[PDB]
């Protein structure tokens, strides 16, 4: 009577504890789909942008090769200029080649490439490839069989070298 | 009694399931902001990595080239030595070094642009004047021009043939 009719809400107050658990699970529809946008739009660019730079990179390198090739072609030119003219005198060509070499250096310096230390300097593994040793001051480069270069911190290529050794 | 109340127990089967479609969502969807947080930490990673990547990437090319061309400098020294003993041989060395240079260039994939006798082409040639030879054709190459496949390392300064 006044105990089942007044407490009949036993299934009434539940309407707010049920429709709500069915009012939120409905909104989560764009919670696994709506988010599928910010995601599938971020993973659509990460597989795109990285594909765009996959280009801008292989290009910046190509650009680097060119930058060098261009700076160095003048040597080929001088080699040509020598074969067609310089043949004047053996000591004329000798001086010409000397000149070409000197040029190659300036060109390298131009791209900021310095030659690592050599004959007389301290043998240093960071810049030197020791091929064996020859008479000279120990711990010091006795002879350079191949110039080594470094541009800044980077090693273009180490110098193949002979390290000094005191005779007895 | 047995079915007058059990046939209702079917309604409770829904509410019992409602806690499976929303209780399982926030289960795996509890990290859908994480497996995404990383996908943005890597996509926001390149955004700053490229400025560097690209730079050092050019150095890569320059080194790649220098690496391949230093042998020329090596041969120049080698040549100067053969000449220190027999001056006459110097001419022979230069010829070798020069031919060497071409091979190297080939190695990096650069070819010489069409020359003497070949049709003038602005893609590769820089006409600076005229000189005897088939009209509209390269008559003499004053400076070699090279192309790396599509790109142009540098154009050949050339003289084009005069018609008539």
Curated annotation (Swiss-Prot), chain A:
Protein keywords: Chaperone, Cytoplasm, Stress response
InterPro entries for this protein: GrpE (IPR000740), GrpE_coiled_coil (IPR013805), GrpE_head (IPR009012)
Cofactor notes: Required to stimulate the ATPase activity of DnaK.
Molecular function in Gene Ontology: adenyl-nucleotide exchange factor activity; protein homodimerization activity; protein-folding chaperone binding; unfolded protein binding
Chaperone in keyword set: yes
Compartment list: Cytoplasm
Record flagged with keyword Chaperone: yes
GO biological process: protein folding
One GO term describing the cellular component: cytoplasm
Co-factor(s): K(+)
UniProt family annotation: Belongs to the GrpE family.
Quaternary structure annotation from Swiss-Prot or TrEMBL: Homodimer.
Function recorded in the entry: Participates actively in the response to hyperosmotic and heat shock by preventing the aggregation of stress-denatured proteins, in association with DnaK and GrpE. It is the nucleotide exchange factor for DnaK and may function as a thermosensor. Unfolded proteins bind initially to DnaJ; upon interaction with the DnaJ-bound protein, DnaK hydrolyzes its bound ATP, resulting in the formation of a stable complex. GrpE releases ADP from DnaK; ATP binding to DnaK triggers the release of the substrate protein, thus completing the reaction cycle.
Record-given protein name: Protein GrpE
């Amino acid at each position: 009577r006044n105990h089942e009719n007044t407490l009949e809400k036993d299934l009434e107050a539940v309407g707010q504890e049920a429709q709500a658990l069915e009012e939120r699970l409905k909104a989560a529809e764009e919670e696994l789909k709506g988010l599928k946008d910010k995601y599938l739009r971020l993973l659509a660019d990460f597989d795109n942008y990285r594909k765009r730079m996959e280009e801008e990179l292989k290009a910046r390198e190509r650009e680097g090769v060119l930058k060098a090739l261009r700076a160095l072609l003048p040597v080929l030119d001088d080699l040509d200029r020598a074969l067609e003219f310089a043949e004047a005198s053996p000591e004329s060509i000798r001086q010409g080649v000397r000149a070409i070499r000197d040029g190659f250096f300036r060109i390298l310096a131009g791209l900021g490439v310095e030659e690592v230390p050599g004959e007389g300097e301290a043998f240093d593994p960071r810049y030197h490839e020791a091929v064996g040793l020859l008479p000279g001051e120990p711990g010091k480069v006795a002879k350079v069989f191949q110039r080594g270069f470094r541009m800044g911190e980077a090693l273009v290529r180490p110098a193949r070298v002979a390290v000094g050794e005191e005779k007895r």
